[PDB]
Amino acid sequence: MDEFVKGLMKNGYLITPSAYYLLVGHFNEGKFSLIELIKFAKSRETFIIDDEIANEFLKSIGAEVELPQEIK
Known about the structure:
The longest helix has 12 residues, at 17-28. Helix content is 57%, strand content 6%. It is globular, with a radius of gyration of 12 Å. It has one domain (1-72): Helicase, Ruva Protein, domain 3. The chain is mainly alpha-helical. This is DNA polymerase II small subunit.
């Protein structure tokens, strides 16, 4: 489909549209690299990047810092 989609499949990694629609924006802009995405899933020991992973990822790396409260 695309570079991002092909990049994952290259390492036997799959991605859902729910996460692609979001991860694409953070990937296309040049925020995170493919190497970082795979490094995250590695710690989780999984070959499926779903919305749950995408959320924890950006939250782990420290990106998209936009919260209504923002405490700590």
